[PDB]
Structure 1
């Protein structure tokens, strides 16, 4: 990857997975009879994963402007993050995507723990359209992960939080997407505008997918201009945002 980095090209290196690199180095060191540390890992394992990871960098226009992005995978045992290798890699990386088995089993996939996941960098990188439209999404999702423990109870449900329980359910159904089907930003931001602005409230929770598949068509055909400008120009100028509201309200009146 350092080649693309130094020669002015952008790269992406996926380590799947570094827990097994740590195990391999542990074997290699214990058989060399080097003194072990915690969890039988050698002392410098922090040096192992740091020397590996932070080679990832974004270079100056004076050194080539290339880059290399590192997505190291770690398999936590029983969800424990206090283990030694996880404790180190969480500290080395700029952020984490925490995939939760409790979500994976419920059929929420990708099972990202929106609460524990964090990107202490990427907020400055996000495609502007998605920053605009998802400004409210993290708050809505945290409120939902609070209120959802109350999902089961009857008509006594408070009206104030009923809107939370609606929007969060719809947003959870939106954020799940089938494997090997990655979506373009132009297809991403319209759905998140529909969700955050609560247009999906009038749709049954089992039909959200039929929305996401159908809505993309309504956009692609009826509003090619909007998707095209969102991808090509990169941001949702107010005029395009009004186009987006109009298109969503139109399809939803249809749907």
Structure 2
């Protein structure tokens, strides 16, 4: 059956190729092997051992070359013959990777046949220059109003999502992918995002839940999943983000807009730490190796909104950092913060105190966000960041601030907070977000008692669509509110609020 076809494939393998050179392994262990020979080796080549494991030569030393094993020690054996692959470490890239889970090597762990890939491209590739870059302008709509007003994110934009462990950290990103399902189920290539979810240092079980979740939301067909689970060897984990970014760069260098979410670069740090220590390179600050800054920076800067001349390329980057009980001062977090532009710090206290999503607004910034932001969402978003940093101040001294002015702000602020909350894995449309922000900003949400705010939101939206979805279509295309649209919305909002 299938067995006969496999057997046909088996018949279809039989080499007779000459081996340019081999080496013989010397002392081996610590996930590095020291090989004798390999004199014609290129640096950062891939070598394949006769255990079938492959490794990357790191230290080319007089008289010996020291492979780093991308794969388990158990397989490799002393005095084993190391054969040169002959190629610098490259991974398959192409259009066929969409809807395929792969491991870092590019093996199909989805098992939907051998991967369809146009090319292979070197694992490390230099980031495009100054002249290749162009300032961002297109939005990425996450479907979380806060993460679209308070933090607007754009195409090709480097950004940071930082916060406390397994607070459904992953969910925040998943929602972005889900929200852009309708944009990606669009036919406009520009508004198509090809999203790559890099799972590093995660339980293979957890990843399987993720895959199933994505396939439940049928989002898999526009997305690639790269996997470097906790079980997978520490050098494989080390090269895992870099490899994922190569795949992303192929899309970027198709000019196509994309997104890559690197969950969690904090686990890449631990991996690189392990590797460094096992290479007996002296421990750096906080015992994390001294090139840890370099590691992250080289990874991160391979995401860019390439200039229209160079392709109009985009590859948005969201890298997910796992803070150890918060406190953003901490070497690994600070190193990342410096590279990224914008942070989306999440607050545990708020999470516990039932704000899902728990987007701390004290420590969420977007350092290039407003360019991406759509004009509709600039107009309706009337310095809401300022307003809720007046709410933040007001409630700071509330427990004093008994002034009616402060109270008015507090009433608005608390109620506004209710609007921010969104039931995770159910993201709101951008068009729909425009009225909600109008309502709250224009203070028609004081007209809603705090308890009934949730009811108000759904009902308000239902009312608007029924009353006139004409407005919503108009702002959907115009992406701006004219004085008339603004008035129409004010009037309509007053109408529902009253009712």
Q: TM-score w.r.t. structure 2 length?
A: 0.49
In structure 2, C-alpha distance between the alignment counterparts of 1:195 and 1:108, rounded to whole Å: 18
1:85-126 Cα distance to aligned partner (Å, 9 max, x none): 101011000110010001111111211111221111111110
Larger strand percent: 2
1:15-53 Cα distance to aligned partner (Å, 9 max, x none): 111111000010011111122211221111111111111
Ranges of 4+ aligned residues in structure 1 off by more than 4 Å: none
Which of the numbers 312, 326, 330 marks the counterpart of 1:83?
Answer: 330
Give the deviation of 1:135 after TM superposition: 2.2
In structure 1, C-alpha distance between the alignment counterparts of 2:449 and 2:479, rounded to whole Å: 32
Which of the numbers 451, 471, 480 marks the counterpart of 1:206?
Answer: 451
Alignment of 1:181-196 (within 5 A): 181-196=426-441
- 1:85 match: secondary structure: helix
* Residues paired across the two proteins, number: 252
Q: TM-score w.r.t. structure 1 length?
A: 0.95
1:221-250 Cα distance to aligned partner (Å, 9 max, x none): 112011111112211122111111011000
- For the structure 1 residues 74 and 62, does the alpha-carbon distance in structure 2 shift closer, same or farther, using more than 3 Å as the test? same
Larger helix percent: 1
1:132-187 Cα distance to aligned partner (Å, 9 max, x none): 111221111001111124556xx993211111011101110001111011111111
| Structure 2, gaps ≥5 residues long | 1-247
- 2:350 match: secondary structure: helix
**Contact 1:140-1:167 within 8 A present in 2 as well:** no
- 1:80 match: secondary structure: coil
Supply the RMSD in Å over aligned alpha carbons.
1.5
**Contact 1:128-1:235 within 8 A present in 2 as well:** yes
Which residue number corresponds to residue 376 of structure 2?
Answer: 129
Q: Which piece of structure 1 moves more, 185-194 or 30-39? A: 30-39
Greater CA radius of gyration, 1 or 2?
Answer: 2
| Structure 1, gaps ≥5 residues long | none
**Contact 1:99-1:112 within 8 A present in 2 as well:** yes
**Contact 1:39-1:84 within 8 A present in 2 as well:** yes
In structure 2, C-alpha distance between the alignment counterparts of 1:125 and 1:34, rounded to whole Å: 42
